[PDB]
Amino acid sequence: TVAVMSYSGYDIEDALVLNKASLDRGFGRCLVYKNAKCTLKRYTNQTFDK
Amino acid sequence: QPMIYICGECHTENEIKSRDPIRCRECGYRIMYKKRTKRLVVFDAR
């Protein structure tokens, strides 16, 4: 719900201003998933990781 | 006593406790997922 106006001086060059009380109600909320993988193997000599 | 894994398809509880190959006791499926932890965790409603 945007307004097009000059306001507060922290918005000069392509910066923009958000409403704190919307961020609290869910706006712009997100998730970030990352991955971590590992493997165990058997060597040519008869031994293996544990 | 041994740890339990959930088969990826039929969700039948399995147990390994060994160097055995990962295979479902019931079906042919070959993917296993660990169970949820038993401890409680505390979150903030923010």
Binding site: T1, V2, A3, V4, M5, G28 | -
Partner: protein
């Protein structure tokens, strides 16, 4: 629209353009970009950072 100031309480002079626009949030986030190095590992060949 006609708008009232939220800080002073007295109405603004101009009329303000108001309405719905579709905004999308990009993947560039500052938390994944901050960085600083006091003193750390050095390369073996030339012993610069």
């Amino acid at each position: 629209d006609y708008v009232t100031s939220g800080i002073t309480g007295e109405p603004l002079e101009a009329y303000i353009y108001f309405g719905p626009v579709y905004y999308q949030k990009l993947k560039h986030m500052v938390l994944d970009k901050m960085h600083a190095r006091a003193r750390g590992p050095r390369a073996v060949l030339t012993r610069q950072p």
